[PDB]
């Protein structure tokens, strides 16, 4: 088909590697490709240089090296291993006294490696490390909320790398430094730093009313050592003020680069703000015995000049994207690595006193378990380490490109006000103002803008084209928000001829403020509208016509699209759907030019120019994190010549390299007998007939057999008291055979556990005697199929103990994994959605003969309700429907750019070219206008949609240009009394399906302490009838129903047993009794030494324990 | 101190707190018996007091007692009682209940006001004991045990059990609830109509009082068990019996977008 693309804007640059924020971060952190000697003081190297050398004997660090992974990615995912590399470190142990040197390369465990797509494999599960936004380290000034004419100066280092320090000008006039939740006069610290009254007065006297409050005669009288001892006494009361102790404490508080660390960003920001230069990342230095100040006097001068009103000093916007930076995967992993290294160093120092001081080696000195556990902790249980969202490839891409304000070192949910969640002006081109969750997380989780990239200091930069004179260069400059605040930046749609600005007046921004400006005032210009929005948002055609609230919904829901077995790219694309697949690594591509040698359902072989024969295997029917089948299909043929960068295989949710998240369906926008009421959606059975919206899912079941204190759990086909009917599809060893259908209640793996020790009841004695059969030693504990699940067994993995290459966790004999796949067709309750936020549930699947259909017999596929449109303000879907009608008749697709897309005149032109195909084919085949069409035209010209007096063909064309057509009701043959919008719309089947949601329980598992039912379909749990539900029942006055919920349904053990017995016997339910959880409350209050007594009206005790707890 | 599926042990934090207390108390008794000096005895007594404090209300005074290699404060009796997760609010003013289900809801415009569409497989479990009794009454099974083993497998289900479930649920009502339950109309009673599929069919007129729509909502189902509970649900909680809002007296079961539009 033809692909018509609109859009005048030409982008001087393509989108950056969309996962580079993860890739470059981790690559710079590890430096595995750099030869050791040429590494830089960053990441792991910086952590090693920070922890070493370790003194009192001296142990120093030479270099580190990473090895090769013991098992590749696929084997790791298979066997529940972590994809990791061995880390070795060359350390030389020195005796500063002797001169002895013993140098050894110690092994510090493994470090997890990042995969090709920027993700990780932790214990076989794919996980993503989400970037974390936080206030940049540095020196800020912010107004004191108490006094308007005063300001608090904040000094903020990296998280966990030093204390915040607050400088305030108290009402009494003296400057107070606040550290570690304790205030003191900054004058004392200045005296510790060696400042004398002469220098302080000549340096700060220009501000008259402040240096007086700074002056303290006693502090200037006492020497630096005396002031240091006095400050130590002020900071740590009770501790004896020993001089070496005070030196150590103040040093490790203000000057130790191992205990106090501004970021590199913090250092640069302090320098840029205060007009100074920093020797290192500390506030002061320890040189030649004394403390030499570097930050405190500059910050104090700036604070004084700000309090006075001196020009050139401003408050700082702490939500400016030049004061908020991104800690990426490399930085977070490096922080945890440094903490593990510090614990290893504590162990090293403790062992440098024990043992024989004469004979020791680094191999004896180093224990790696702190570092090993501190890395495993991060990767396995951090909040920023999330289970990878790999529903479809765009899910993983967006997931990696997400920014969290939550997490360790950041805000908890209560600490989020409005300032953080707000869209800042500097979000322009850096953070998407659309893509964010609804609910309690809005404004905390966001996504990186498309063209934006994080610089080496952690700030997000956006590109702009240079404009000199009136010429727009092709040179791009990536700017932070701070540097963006310097320039007049015109919009991307401003007209041009060649490289020259065309209009007399252009729309530009100065510090985000919009301003109309002459072409001589234009300093820079936008690159594209795309740079303002995320990758997902940029997939929404006609976005300029969609209200942001619903555009958010569509953008987020694209993440939830299920890869369909017949997926298609939308008829109306935005241009990015190819780059999305590429950078997500869904599809497969040819490396160099060449010719296809072999093509299999499992592999593709290519003979390149180099003569080398390269073979690519195809991932076929693999199960993703969410059970959506990742599956590559070959898209080339044998002998087909390919070039560098051509397509060889489509990934899941990919059509010929284009992102295929749903299907293109013929939709009619009209009410239908209340079946689309309140956003329900009506669909045609022909969709099921041709397998539209049909997706393959796989579920993994697992069962262990271990050693007991009563005998071995055995995975076996011999299960007691079970029929061959029940054992049909089990192999010799008890495992279900590959390829058999399994329903709820079917055995996937048979297993016998040894019966617990217990005496048979006298009933069982008599029954065993009656029947003459031995009660077996073992007990049926097989892994059956859960309710509402099942499908086809496609894989069985068996692992025993003692067979080669396998070792399970202690006690476990054998493990078995069954894989059950299913071909889920669309059904009632499944959730569909378009890219504009229109989301609904399939409510009615009608037979084809009921569907509203065109005059030429074509039935529509989806009936949507116009009532969903007006209050939602998402007309973009209407425009997409019109263009889809045009392309449906012309047999062609379109690329409508964001904010530079198809406009109504061109859409009308395409609609006319389509109406010719629609109506002239009929008029040539020997058919005129239908009587019902004439009636609809009558009512339409009454509606004011066509001009009265023109021919029926001309009026039908007038309607078609409005995207409206005649529609016959397939149930009557009588037409719809009006013309209706019919067209091709791109609709996705979202992840939320009734087969997953539907659950029901009568009796089941109860909890240990509360004796109330468990919760969650997974555990066959009951529904939580909570406080508000009790309120509803109370307000209704349904006392007995409420008492059932409180006693018979959940907590009354006696009553629930008796109620089940009564219901199966046909008796009315029995009167309830005491809830076990109330007995629990009574006993816990007793544990709190509180006598709680139930009493009759005579104030005598009542035993709700029935004598069991009274002697 | 329970064993789990994998033969591993899970225990309450109260046991570790009690162990702290036992150890410090026994060490204090031994220190007293051995005539230890007053500094040592004072240290032991203050540690004993802190251990009792941590057992009763951990975190109340001083740093919270944690587990080794963890930042998680141990859960004390005060924590067990108080809080949104505490005993009262979590298990006494509200409980998880038997005979309940949950499923995605669907528009179901053909229902009368007093009705809803309950999927077959949901009702099969929601009324399982009634169905066992009716399958014993009719000839479909010798006894309750055989009937239950017959329902256990999903391929052993024959049409007579579906007709028996129909006979079982005749006239009975079920409660539909959609969270959040903001007023007494967030729960209503309906005569269920067994339908194929897996979706609950709500009536259009009650969507407004429920704040329910069909963009993926789900509702919970409850089966009133006793004759008294059934009487309560049918007389006082039936949808067609609550047409006016208790907040204003005006009708809140009134025509909605599509109905208004057609009329």
């Amino acid at each position: 088909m033809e692909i018509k693309r609109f859009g005048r804007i030409r982008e001087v640059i393509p989108l950056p590697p969309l996962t580079e924020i993860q890739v470059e971060s981790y690559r710079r952190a590890l430096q595995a490709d750099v030869p050791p000697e040429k590494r830089e003081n960053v990441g792991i190297q910086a952590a090693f240089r920070e922890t070493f050398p370790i003194e009192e004997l001296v142990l120093d660090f030479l270099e580190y090296r990473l090895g090769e992974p013991p098992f590749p990615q696929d084997e790791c995912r298979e066997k529940d291993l972590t994809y990791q590399a061995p880390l070795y470190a060359r350390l030389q142990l020195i005796h500063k006294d002797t001169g002895l040197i013993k140098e050894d390369e110690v092994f510090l465990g493994h470090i997890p490696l990042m995969t090709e797509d920027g993700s990780f494999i932790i214990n076989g599960a794919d996980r993503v490390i989400v970037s974390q936004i936080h206030r940049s380290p540095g020196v800020y000034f912010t107004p004191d909320p108490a006094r308007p004419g005063r300001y608090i100066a904040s000094i903020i280092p990296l998280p966990k790398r030093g204390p915040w320090i607050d400088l305030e000008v108290e009402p009494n006039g003296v400057v107070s430094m606040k550290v570690n939740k304790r205030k003191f006069p900054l004058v004392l610290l200045l005296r510790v730093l060696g400042y004398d009254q002469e220098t302080l007065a000549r340096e700060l006297g220009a501000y008259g009313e402040l240096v007086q409050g700074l002056m303290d005669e006693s502090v200037f009288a006492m020497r630096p050592e005396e002031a240091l001892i006095r400050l130590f006494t002020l900071l740590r009361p009770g501790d004896p003020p020993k001089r070496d102790k005070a030196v150590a404490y103040v040093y490790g508080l203000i000057a130790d680069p191992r205990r106090y660390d501004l970021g590199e960003a913090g250092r640069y920001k302090a320098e840029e703000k205060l007009g100074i230069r920093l020797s290192g990342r500390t506030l002061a230095r320890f040189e030649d015995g004394e403390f030499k100040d570097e930050v405190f006097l500059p910050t104090l001068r700036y604070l004084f000049a700000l309090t006075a009103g001196v020009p050139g000093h401003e408050v700082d916007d702490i939500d400016h994207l030049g004061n908020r930076r991104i800690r990426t995967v490399g930085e977070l992993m490096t922080d945890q690595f440094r903490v593990g290294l510090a614990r290893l160093a504590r162990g090293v120092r403790e062992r440098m006193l024990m043992g024989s001081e004469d004979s020791l080696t680094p191999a004896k000195l180093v224990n790696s378990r702190p570092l090993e556990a501190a890395i495993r902790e991060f990767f396995s249980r951090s909040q920023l380490s999330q289970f990878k969202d790999e529903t479809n490839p765009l899910s993983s891409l967006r997931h990696k490109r997400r920014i969290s304000a939550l997490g360790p070192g950041g805000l908890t949910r209560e600490r989020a006000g409005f300032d953080v969640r707000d869209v800042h002006r500097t979000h322009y081109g850096r953070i998407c103002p659309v893509e964010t969750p609804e609910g309690a997380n809005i404004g905390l989780i966001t996504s990186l803008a498309a063209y934006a990239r994080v610089d080496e200091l952690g700030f997000i930069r956006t590109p702009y084209r240079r404009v000199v004179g009136g010429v727009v260069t092709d040179e791009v400059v990536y700017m932070t928000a701070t540097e963006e605040d310097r320039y007049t930046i015109a919009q991307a749609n401003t007209p041009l001829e060649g490289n020259r600005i065309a209009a007399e007046r252009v729309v530009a921004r100065r510090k985000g403020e919009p301003v109309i400006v002459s072409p001589e005032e234009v300093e820079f210009m936008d690159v594209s509208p795309k740079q303002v929005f995320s990758v997902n948002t940029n997939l929404i055609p006609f976005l300029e016509h969609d209200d942001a609230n619903r555009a958010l919904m569509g953008s987020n829901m694209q993440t939830q699209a299920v890869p369909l077995i017949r997926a298609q790219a939308p008829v109306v694309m935005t241009g990015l759907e190819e780059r999305v697949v590429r950078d997500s690594l869904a599809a497969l591509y040819a490396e160099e030019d060449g010719e296809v040698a072999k093509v299999d359902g499992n592999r593709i072989v290519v003979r390149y120019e180099d003569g080398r024969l390269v073979e690519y295997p195809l991932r076929r029917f693999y199960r993703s994190n969410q059970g959506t089948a990742l599956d590559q299909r070959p898209r080339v043929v044998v002998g087909q010549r390919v070039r560098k960068g051509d397509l060889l295989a489509d990934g899941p949710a990919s059509e010929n390299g284009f992102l295929a998240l749903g299907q293109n369906v013929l939709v009619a926008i009209m009410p239908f007998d209340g079946y689309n009421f309140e956003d329900a959606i009506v669909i045609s059975e022909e969709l099921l007939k041709r397998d539209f919206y049909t997706s393959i899912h796989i579920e993994r079941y697992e069962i262990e057999a271990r050693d007991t204190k009563l005998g071995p759990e055995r995975i076996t086909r011999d299960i007691p008291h079970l029929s061959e009917a029940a054992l049909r599809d089990l192999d010799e060893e008890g495992v279900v055979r590959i390829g058999a259908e399994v329903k709820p209640g079917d055995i996937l793996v048979g297993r016998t556990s040894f019966k617990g020790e217990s005496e048979p009841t006298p009933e069982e004695r008599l029954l065993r005697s009656i029947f003459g059969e031995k009660a077996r030693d073992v007990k049926d504990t097989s892994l059956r199929v859960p309710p509402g699940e099942g499908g086809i067994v496609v894989r069985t993995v068996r692992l025993r103990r003692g067979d080669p290459g396998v070792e399970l966790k202690p006690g476990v004999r054998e493990v078995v994994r069954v894989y059950v796949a299913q071909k889920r067709k669309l059904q009632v309750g499944d959730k569909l959605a378009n890219r504009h936020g229109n989301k609904g549930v399939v409510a009615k699947i009608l037979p084809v003969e009921d569907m509203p259909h065109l005059p030429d017999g074509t039935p529509v596929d989806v009936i949507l309700n116009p009532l969903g449109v007006p209050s939602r303000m998402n007309l973009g879907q209407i425009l997409e429907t019109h263009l889809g009608l045009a392309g449906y008749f012309l047999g062609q697709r379109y690329i409508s750019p964001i904010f530079d897309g198809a406009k109504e005149p061109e859409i009308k032109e395409l609609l006319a070219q389509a109406f010719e195909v629609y109506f002239g084919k009929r008029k040539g085949e020997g058919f005129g206008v239908d009587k019902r069409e004439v009636e609809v035209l009558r009512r339409a010209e009454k509606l004011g949609l066509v001009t009265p007096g023109k021919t029926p063909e001309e009026q039908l064309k007038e309607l078609f240009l409005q995207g409206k057509v005649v529609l016959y009701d397939g149930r009557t043959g009588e037409p719809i009394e009006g013309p209706i919008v019919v067209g091709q719309m791109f609709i996705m089947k979202l992840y939320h399906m009734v087969e997953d949601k539907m659950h029901a329980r009568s009796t089941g598992p109860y909890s240990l302490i509360t004796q109330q039912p468990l919760g969650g379909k997974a555990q066959f749990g009951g529904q939580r009838f909570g406080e508000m539900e009790v309120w509803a029942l109370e307000a209704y006055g349904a006392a007995h129903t409420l008492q059932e919920m409180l006693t018979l349904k959940s907590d009354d053990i006696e009553g629930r047993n008796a109620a089940y017995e009564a219901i199966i016997k046909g008796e009315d339910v029995p009167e309830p009794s005491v809830p076990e959880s109330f007995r629990v409350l009574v006993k816990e209050l007793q544990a709190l030494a509180l006598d709680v007594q139930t009493l009759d009206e005579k104030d005598n005790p009542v035993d709700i324990f029935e004598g069991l707890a009274s002697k | 101190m329970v064993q789990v599926d994998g033969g591993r042990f899970a225990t309450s934090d109260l046991n570790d707190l009690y162990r702290r207390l036992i150890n410090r108390n026994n060490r204090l008794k031994k220190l007293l018996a051995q005539g230890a000096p007053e500094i040592i005895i004072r240290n032991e007594k203050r540690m004993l007091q802190e251990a009792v404090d941590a057992l009763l209300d951990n975190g109340r005074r001083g740093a919270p007692v944690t587990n080794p290699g963890s930042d998680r404060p141990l859960r004390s009796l005060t924590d067990i009682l108080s809080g949104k997760q505490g005993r009262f609010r979590q298990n006494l003013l509200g409980k998880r209940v038997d005979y309940s289900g949950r499923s995605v809801i669907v528009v179901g415009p053909q229902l009368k006001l007093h009705q809803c569409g309950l999927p077959k497989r949901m009702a099969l479990e929601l009324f399982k004991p009634f169905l066992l009794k009716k399958m014993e009454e009719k000839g479909i099974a010798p006894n309750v045990k055989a009937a239950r083993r017959m329902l256990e497998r999903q391929r052993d289900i024959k049409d007579e059990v579906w007709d028996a479930l129909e006979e079982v649920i005749h006239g009975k009502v079920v409660l539909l609830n959609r969270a959040p339950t903001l007023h007494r109309l967030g729960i209503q009673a309906f005569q269920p109509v067994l339908v194929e599929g897996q979706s609950i069919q709500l009536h259009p007129l009650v969507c407004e009082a429920f704040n329910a729509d069909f963009d993926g909502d789900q509702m919970a189902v409850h089966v009133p068990l006793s004759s008294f509970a059934q009487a309560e649900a049918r007389i006082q909680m039936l949808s067609a019996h609550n047409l006016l809002s208790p907040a204003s007296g005006e009708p809140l079961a009134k025509p909605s977008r599509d109905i208004i539009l057609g009329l």
Partner: peptide, 14 residues
Amino acid sequence: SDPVRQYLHEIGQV
């Protein structure tokens, strides 16, 4: 307020 600090002070008197 801090038991370790208090016991260290009590120790530092003998």
